[PDB]
Design a protein around this ligand. Structure first.
Ligand SMILES: Nc1ncnc2c1ncn2[C@@H]1O[C@H](COP(=O)(O)OP(=O)(O)OP(O)(O)=S)[C@@H](O)[C@H]1O
Ligand SMILES: Nc1ncnc2c1ncn2[C@@H]1O[C@H](COP(=O)(O)OP(=O)(O)OP(O)(O)=S)[C@@H](O)[C@H]1O
Ligand SMILES: Nc1ncnc2c1ncn2[C@@H]1O[C@H](COP(=O)(O)OP(=O)(O)OP(O)(O)=S)[C@@H](O)[C@H]1O
Ligand SMILES: Nc1ncnc2c1ncn2[C@@H]1O[C@H](COP(=O)(O)OP(=O)(O)OP(O)(O)=S)[C@@H](O)[C@H]1O
Lengths: 849, 849
């Protein structure tokens, strides 16, 4: 079919044959059809591909008019009996040209290409155009180089390959509102990268296409001017200015109220620069050039700090992150796209779960991207598995080849006639069994694959019908809108439903099919999340009974005594993983006590327990504090400063390990310099670093620790600290920290004197671990602590003022020192005996062998 | 060889000879190369040497273009052939001109001088150009960097299309006066960005074209510079400095005198001097280089302190934000511009509102900037509102189209004849019904559109006639000015008035145009501000007293009891809001009652209402307080002493939240020296600090709290405290506090003891908040509190001394921690059962499922 421009030329050619009473419509008339006027700025006459291509128009009009005179007349009714072979071919070739250029309709431009292929003027010395070489270049020389350096967003949005962007309607309308401004008329989208800023623009393109804009903008058009525009479409010094003040100049006039945009967005800080004004200001001032800009939060600040003129030319727009609900709605709209992408079924609950998980395990990553990546990655994953089902197929194929080896090893011989090798027949029988089992597995699997291919295509076809329906609706093309809405779409819809039923669900499983090829809400998605990030905080691992429910016992086992603290912890972690801890606040505690009490041991054991890794913990030296409080703290240094470790000791670790237990050392030594930062983590954990990037602390439990309370706790008035003493501690804590800081801590916890009844068990744990960690048991002890070593250790070391620490020392002082001596003296070959003789008395083994 | 302009103009001559297929390239083609188009603005054609040299350029245009046509046409092989002697000589002579001018390349003007010497127009009335010495005088007017780095503000002003500058008349004159100086004549505008500092520059541009400028300056041009030659980008050392030198010296040649303007001195400074940026400016502080600089008050001081020279190169010209009334005057001057800029009408009260509101909500942004945007945005909003036309028409037309689709869909069938689908005729009735509604709606909208349209067009015509009159008047063209005043302008005014008759405000529609809602006072403006900043109570078109009163009623309802306290506060606040209280004094209160009484919450609610945010509350622990009162308060330590974070806790919040509430928690425990500071704090809001800067507390309510008389309140003498009880808490206040304090406090506010009869409401409110705040779910309780929880929570929880603090803790432990555990046990699918067992617990709703 033809465009309005092309159809006009066709129509005019026919008109001219009738007007001149000619029996045949010839290229001469179509050439005449182009030269409607003698206008210098008209593409049909002097901005024409022919003029710029090869033959001059003063000469052209002479050629055309000479032929119009030479072509014979009729008595009007017989005009145009034929179009000649020539226009038949040219007009159809113009369709061929569409196909070469991948255009939807025949352009007048295409008719000119068709004419170049067939342009020949009868004469002894015939006139002609170059077959096509010049015109391909001349097409670029029409306003169209815009398409060389830019994507016509409205053309593409109208054509297809554009997602149903939703949840951005507020922002789309706001962007349009800015375009409706008179001074700051160039909206700018600001936020996280990857947030749908382009999607907003695309949404605007759709509204322009639909004419759902405030009248003035109905005459508008959107283009993405980039990449090629920036650099790739050129190679010489000065080419920038030439393509810039070329494509922009073309854009600036006549061809609709063109609005441009950048996809590399921050790029204006390099694509503007010397031309920061020239890129727009005078193009807007002289007419209608408008743009939709964009930048990240950090880049926004940079373009402002660098220039700032952009705040006179542009209007800053914040772009939101969607809620899980909104994210899911987005995923649902695109769910069939994803199913088509991989030929995989996707559960609705997988979109919900992926969105919930993405926020829970990667809170600092864009939610809709992360949710999607989790899905597209897992979709891709199962699609890969389904290529071979190797567990059955590779296993049998290997067994078959192993048989082939046995076959040649036994067959290609003289001993082949002896039972020595003729035993081979047994392997051949096995070969046959494997071939017979394998082929139906193979074909069954191919059938399962085909079912997915059928679904893929059925869904694809439906969407194409929809794309077409949407264009028909905006054209108010009732006829094709009806062709699609009635019967065609319902047909494919029903085919899809039938194809889904072809899965042949049976009571034994969701399909007669042996393979899954689906995205299961938790199994597929939770697994993928774990494979991608290690720790799946919302996995809800089966063993909850120990993992949080009986955490008190696990903590009691690792941390003996301090039952009050353990119970305080147990309540805390249950709130953090049950989801009850309100999302507005990471759980946080202050651990107060005496040295050797185990207060940091408990926190480490919490990390141990929750992540199965005590090294999951991130430590903060809150006592090493001065005005430098940057790279070593939760803020980092700031972009523009020398060095790239912008929180290189913490902020990067917090994102690296998205959640953990963050623990601060002796916070009593801390100052507001960082306490007012820790505060930003204590609740509403969104600390923005000097990178412009945010920690977004959520799941992470934050522990503050201190011996501040020792001032009263060390009264030792019972191992269990009593009210009074605790209030004095509380008082002192409030003296040290802003009480409001403290009020954002979930609870302040006071540790007890580590009781001797606890220590009496702790030392066994320690001694066991001490020995086990000493490389290999090529030495070590038999470790018969008996009643006596345990009691010596107690009587000579369970100090009320050092807890477990003096025991570490005692053990070394006695137990390991004597061992070392027995080792050095070659009294031990392996292991060693343990006892006390009155006075620790490590015994000695028979001399080393 | 040739330079870019020269090689191009030669290339064009050569191109024309080959394009028109001429046998020879000659003076006609080079003249044609210069006369590219009829545009006089083409540098090659009329503002060129061609018009300025005398020759009747119309003759060159006609003769040359006619000759391109008359010169014989040839085949491509004979096309062009040679430049001949004729142009050989011209180009060779152009080289001789290079020698004359010291030009490294041949210039287009050299070509013209040479061309002019040899070529003439052979006509019966033959002409030739004035000799080249006269022509060179004209050549020297063109160029000899600003075109790539600056905007010619005076020429812009001369052409109109420049906003009138309002409220800066003296600042404009001040810079002119300074520019008149023989040395160090560069003024620098000092003030915050967005204050209209460039408005002054625009104003100067207007003074130049108005001829109000001293002759010595009058003959000068005015440019807006910086950034393009400072911050835009560099690859090497000196890239900006090269551009500086370029401009710094180009300015000394040909172009009389040029006044430049620098957007920001802070970007210049000198990078540790380092022979960079700013250091190049003092170099020409006597060397003409007239320039108006600009920076901020804050940076200015540090620029000068670090530089030492700047203050002797540039003059310190201060610029400040306009008052709200001045802002409105600016807006009024722009009001009709906004109307034509947007195609809307604007109420004057909207300008008033915009200026008032814009100031009130922007502690971090300039009034004239934001007032101008508030108006440009809000009126853009109204312009966007024209969407009403397609909104109403499309909602209906869309349904119409859906109906039409059904119609074509069902007509093309066999069931179409069956009533099965022939009931379709009803769809046709609906199509028609909608068409009948759509046509008068559409025509209504067309009329509405045209009404405003024509009004706008007439206003635009008026403004351009006015621009012509203003130019005619200032340039003393009394003929033009008189004609414009001689009814041209009065008549367009009459047309505008007749168009107002066509607006035809109807009694039912106060402007016959629903598309143009108009910028309606504060409805449009508050809406706009709210859309841009958040939605406060402040959005309402209410007096300060009414906003307060409506909120006081909510306050009385939300707080349990304490109505007497609320009224005491309300009275004082109203006195203050009215301006009757002396403005120097912030309101302040002493909240006297029981600990746990809600006194803090009253104050928070006051913040929640008067400042629309409970979380803006600033708090002081007065019990943890001794003789050293510093950082934790307002004073900070004295700078010169460690404790640079002056008034780290309170001053910082007050200075960043000037409109808030500050509490003194248990103020009766404050150290006596602090209490004397308090006297300072209770009036004369210019409260001191360590840096010497005062607080200027006005809009911050300061509430001191006290439990001094708590024991009398405990007497339970009425649910609202009665005489002989409240008199004793005041007695205690008189005993403790000096009369001096009591004589400054707006009111001593007395709180009552209140039983569970209404405290239970608090308990319920908190329970509602607690379940509702769970952002990710709604597993709502079967909240079977029954009487047992009402009292348990009010018996083992809510305390006469600690209020709700223990409720919160009971709920966390007996409800949320119990809930967390059973969630992790997977015993909850949805909802949960309350089961108070006498203490408290939850029953598991599923059967431990
Ligand atoms: N509201 C939405 N509805 C549908 N798809 C969306 C939506 N928001 C984002 N997406 C998709 O999420 C991705 C992020 O979109 P983009 O607009 O490219 O991000 P961006 O903000 O443009 O960042 P850059 O700098 O252009 S990568 C895209 O692949 C979009 O298709
Ligand atoms: N209740 C306990 N159960 C098991 N081990 C314990 C216990 N208490 C202390 N320890 C041991 O004591 C050490 C940690 O003691 P803590 O008191 O947490 O550390 P600390 O004394 O605070 O050291 P700081 O605070 O960084 S100086 C570990 O090596 C533990 O094995
Ligand atoms: N008195 C006035 N008369 C006319 N226009 C004004 C007036 N005051 C302010 N403006 C306009 O309001 C804005 C404030 O101007 P400036 O203070 O120069 O902004 P700025 O400091 O230049 O900010 P940048 O750097 O250009 S984003 C300008 O865009 C002026 O056009
Ligand atoms: N009459 C009341 N109106 C509203 N809330 C009240 C009332 N009485 C008690 N409360 C609640 O109980 C608490 C009392 O708070 P406050 O009086 O600030 O306690 P406080 O005296 O500040 O000392 P703490 O340590 O914060 S309890 C608040 O959280 C209130 O919600």
């Amino acid at each position: 079919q033809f465009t309005e421009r092309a159809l006009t030329i066709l129509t005019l050619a026919q008109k001219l044959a009738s007007d001149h009473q000619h029996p045949q419509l010839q290229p001469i008339h179509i050439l005449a059809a182009f030269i409607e006027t003698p206008e210098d700025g008209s593409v049909p006459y002097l901005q024409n591909l022919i003029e710029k291509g090869r033959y001059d128009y003063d000469l052209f009009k002479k050629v055309v008019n000479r032929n119009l005179v030479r072509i014979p007349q009729q008595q009007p009714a017989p005009a145009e009996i034929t179009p000649s072979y020539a226009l038949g071919k040219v007009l159809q070739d113009a369709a061929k040209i569409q196909k070469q250029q991948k255009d939807s309709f025949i352009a007048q431009d295409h008719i000119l290409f068709a004419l170049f292929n067939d342009s020949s003027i009868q004469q002894i010395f015939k006139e002609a155009q170059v077959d096509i070489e010049a015109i391909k270049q001349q097409a670029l020389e029409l306003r169209g180089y815009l398409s060389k350096y830019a994507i016509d967003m409205t053309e593409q949005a109208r054509q297809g390959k554009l997602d149903p962007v939703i949840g951005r309607e507020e922002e789309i309308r706001s962007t349009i509102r800015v375009l409706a401004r008179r001074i700051k008329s160039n909206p700018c989208l600001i936020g996280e990268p990857g947030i749908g800023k382009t999607a907003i623009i695309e949404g605007v393109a759709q509204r322009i296409i639909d004419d759902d804009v405030p009248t003035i903008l109905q005459g508008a058009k959107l283009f993405s001017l980039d990449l090629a525009a920036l650099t790739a479409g050129a190679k010489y010094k000065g080419d920038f200015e030439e393509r810039f003040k070329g494509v922009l100049k073309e854009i600036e006039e006549s061809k609709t109220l063109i609005v441009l945009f950048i996809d590399e967005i921050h790029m204006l800080m390099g694509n503007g620069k010397d031309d920061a004004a020239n890129i727009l200001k005078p193009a807007l001032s002289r007419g209608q050039l408008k743009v939709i800009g964009a930048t990240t939060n950090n880049e926004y600040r940079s373009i402002v700090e660098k220039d700032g003129a952009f705040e006179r030319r542009f209007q800053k727009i914040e772009v939101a992150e969607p809620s899980v609900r909104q994210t899911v709605a987005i995923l649902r709209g695109l769910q069939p796209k994803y199913e088509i992408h991989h030929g995989v079924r996707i559960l609705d609950s997988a979109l919900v779960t992926a969105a919930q998980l993405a926020k829970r395990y990667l809170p600092y990553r864009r939610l809709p991207d992360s949710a999607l990546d989790l899905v597209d990655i897992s979709c891709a994953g199962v699609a890969v598995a389904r290529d071979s089902k190797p567990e059955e197929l590779d296993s049998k194929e290997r067994q078959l080849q192993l048989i082939q080896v046995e076959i040649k090893a036994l067959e290609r011989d003289e001993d082949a006639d002896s039972t020595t090798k003729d035993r081979l027949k047994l392997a051949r029988q096995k070969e046959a069994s494997l071939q017979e089992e394998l082929e139906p597995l193979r074909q069954r699997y191919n059938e399962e694959k085909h079912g997915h291919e059928e679904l893929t295509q059925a869904k694809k076809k439906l969407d194409e019908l929809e794309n077409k329906a949407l264009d028909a609706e905006r054209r108010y093309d009732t006829a094709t809108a009806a062709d699609l809405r009635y019967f065609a779409i319902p047909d494919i819809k029903k085919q899809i439903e039938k194809l889904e039923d072809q899965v042949a669900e049976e009571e034994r499983r969701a399909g007669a099919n042996s393979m899954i090829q689906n995205v299961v809400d938790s199994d597929t998605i939770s697994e993928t999340a774990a494979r991608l990030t290690g720790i799946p905080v919302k996995k809800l691992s089966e063993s909850e009974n120990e993992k949080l429910i009986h955490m008190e016992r696990d903590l009691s086992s690792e941390v003996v005594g301090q039952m009050d603290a353990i119970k305080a912890v147990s309540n805390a972690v249950r709130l953090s993983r049950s989801g009850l801890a309100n999302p507005r606040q990471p759980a946080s505690f202050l651990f107060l006590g005496l040295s050797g009490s185990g207060k940091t041991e408990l926190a480490k054991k919490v990390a141990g327990f929750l992540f199965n890794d005590e090294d999951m913990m991130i430590r903060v030296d809150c006592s090493e504090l001065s005005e430098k409080y940057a790279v070593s703290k939760l803020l980092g240094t700031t972009a523009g400063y020398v060095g790239y470790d912008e929180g290189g000791f913490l902020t990067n670790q917090l994102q690296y390990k998205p959640y953990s237990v963050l623990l601060f050392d002796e916070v009593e030594k801390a100052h507001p310099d960082v306490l007012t930062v820790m505060l930003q983590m204590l609740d509403d954990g969104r600390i923005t670093s000097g990178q412009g990037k945010t920690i977004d602390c959520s799941n992470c439990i934050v522990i503050m620790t201190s011996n501040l309370g020792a001032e009263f706790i060390n009264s030792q008035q019972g191992s269990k600290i009593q009210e009074s003493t605790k209030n004095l501690v509380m008082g002192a804590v409030r003296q040290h920290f802003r009480p409001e800081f403290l009020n954002r801590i979930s609870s302040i916890v006071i540790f007890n004197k580590l009781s001797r009844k606890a220590i009496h068990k702790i030392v066994d744990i320690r001694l066991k671990e001490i020995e086990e960690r000493f490389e290999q048991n090529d030495k070590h002890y038999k470790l018969n602590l008996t009643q006596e070593a345990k009691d010596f250790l107690a009587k000579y070391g369970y100090s009320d003022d050092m807890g477990a620490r003096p025991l570490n020392r005692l053990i070394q002082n006695e137990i390991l020192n004597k061992l070392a001596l027995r080792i050095l003296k070659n009294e031990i070959k392996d292991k060693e005996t343990v006892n006390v003789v009155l006075e620790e008395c490590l015994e000695v083994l028979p001399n080393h062998e």
